[PDB]
């Protein structure tokens, strides 16, 4: 490898400004650059760096073919449902983890940066669906989930309910009712020659 290809845009994933809600999860593939992971385990702001897969110490000795960073804003104690195989209101009709999700998951802490005195009403989450989502899949089609057998041509009423409900965020204690931020780094195994190794000599 040459001296340095380019600094990875990976810092922007952690310290960007605007994030997407859980219903529309956003992704970003990291292109060819020298891996910069030494600044992760040394930071004290991280408190949920628990992840199953490769060792959390031999990060500079890895050459995964391609890496993705996925971001969402699931709130509070709902984070723990992200694990190698779980079910629930979040990992049923939203972000789902397979048994081969090699990589790691990172959680943040919420503050006045993502909050409002009046409240937040621009954040949505899926609550009604008809089947479990396949891993790493999204379903964006929101008219009616047809709870009843009556026609649901688009009239709000009995047996025809909306499938999306807005989050409600207010300044509170914050144990499990704050807009936490969760990102997932996902690695691939082998489809192309390795490009993101991080040696220097």
């Amino acid at each position: 490898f040459p001296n340095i290809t380019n600094l990875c845009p990976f810092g922007e994933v952690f310290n960007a400004t605007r994030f997407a809600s859980v219903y529309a999860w956003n992704r970003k593939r990291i292109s060819n650059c020298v891996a910069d992971y030494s600044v992760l385990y040394n930071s004290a702001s991280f408190s949920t760096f628990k992840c199953y897969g490769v060792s959390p110490t031999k990060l500079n000795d890895l050459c995964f073919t391609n890496v993705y960073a996925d971001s969402f804003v699931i709130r509070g104690d709902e984070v723990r449902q992200i694990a190698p195989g779980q079910t629930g209101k979040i990992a049923d009709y939203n972000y789902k983890l397979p048994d081969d999700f090699t990589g790691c998951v990172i959680a943040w802490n919420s503050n006045n940066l993502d909050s409002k005195v009046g409240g937040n009403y621009n954040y949505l989450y899926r609550l009604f669906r008809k089947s479990n989502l396949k891993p790493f899949e999204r379903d964006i089609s929101t008219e009616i989930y047809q709870a009843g057998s009556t026609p649901c041509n688009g009239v709000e009423g009995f047996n025809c309910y909306f499938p999306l409900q807005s989050y409600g965020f207010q300044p509170t204690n914050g144990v499990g009712y704050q807009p936490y931020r969760v990102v997932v780094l996902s690695f691939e195994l082998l489809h192309a020659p390795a490009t993101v190794c991080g040696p220097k000599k």
Epitope: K130, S131, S149, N159, F162, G168, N173
Partner: single-chain antibody, 225 residues
Framework: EVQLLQSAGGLVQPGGSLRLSCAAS????????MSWVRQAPGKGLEWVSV???????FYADSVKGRFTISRDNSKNTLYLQMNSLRVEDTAVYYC????????????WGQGTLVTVSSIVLTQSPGTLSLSPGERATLSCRAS???????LAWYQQKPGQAPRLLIY???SRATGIPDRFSGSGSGTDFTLTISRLEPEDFAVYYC?????????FGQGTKLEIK
């Protein structure tokens, strides 16, 4: 005309096997949340089980593993198999659909009775015996201080099934008269009935959702001095 019929009124031998049944009357069970709750006579209500669309199963904290709830779309049933049953498990086993965010337990079943061998939520006021012609105040406090709209209210009736009064502490359910009001925020909520009517003397409960296993209040009965 949604109806939920049940048939479980049978005495059970010690360590016996029973099978309850909840049917449907127009709405498919494969597209909506379902829940089984325990009445626990002599005390407040409590939670038993929840089935999501899909078919993931959530059980209460007191009981682990032994409860076996099953869903049958072929006959449109919400079966629950009671295995070997121990002491202090005699209560009613209501079943109801769940729309927690938008309307909490709008329609319930009818109830049953199973015999035996041979978040900190509290509600303050109490009986508060009064007379018709004025209003009243019912206060429901909480220890966790749920933020905005995850608390609802229910009304009991002797021999009947629980009904819905207000969902999310902001708007009442359909068919509710305009004499019921609710307010409050932060830690406690207040509910008021104006122009008391003879068809209003009933026990009121406050329930919390959108959190750890759902909890109801102990019970506030209204009586005439």
């Amino acid at each position: 005309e949604v109806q939920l019929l049940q048939s479980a009124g049978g005495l059970v031998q010690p360590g016996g096997s029973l099978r309850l049944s909840c049917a449907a009357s127009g709405f498919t069970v494969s597209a909506n949340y379902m829940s089984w709750v325990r009445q626990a006579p002599g005390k407040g209500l409590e939670w038993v089980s929840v089935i999501y669309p899909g078919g993931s199963t959530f059980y209460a904290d007191s009981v682990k593993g032994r409860f076996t709830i099953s869903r049958d779309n072929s006959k449109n049933t919400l079966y629950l198999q009671m295995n070997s049953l121990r002491v202090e498990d005699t209560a009613v086993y209501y079943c109801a659909r769940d729309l927690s965010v938008a309307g909490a337990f709008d329609i319930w079943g009818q109830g049953t009775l199973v015999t035996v061998s041979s978040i900190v939520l509290t509600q303050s006021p109490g009986t508060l015996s009064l007379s018709p012609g004025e209003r009243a105040t019912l206060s429901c406090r909480a220890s966790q201080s749920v933020s905005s709209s995850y608390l609802a209210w229910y009304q009991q009736k002797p021999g009947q099934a629980p009904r819905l009064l207000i969902y999310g502490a902001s708007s009442r359910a359909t068919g509710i008269p305009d004499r019921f009001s609710g307010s409050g925020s932060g830690t406690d909520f207040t509910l008021t009935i104006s122009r008391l009517e003879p068809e209003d003397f009933a026990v009121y409960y406050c329930q919390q959702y959108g959190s750890s296993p759902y909890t109801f209040g102990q019970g506030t009965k209204l009586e005439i001095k």
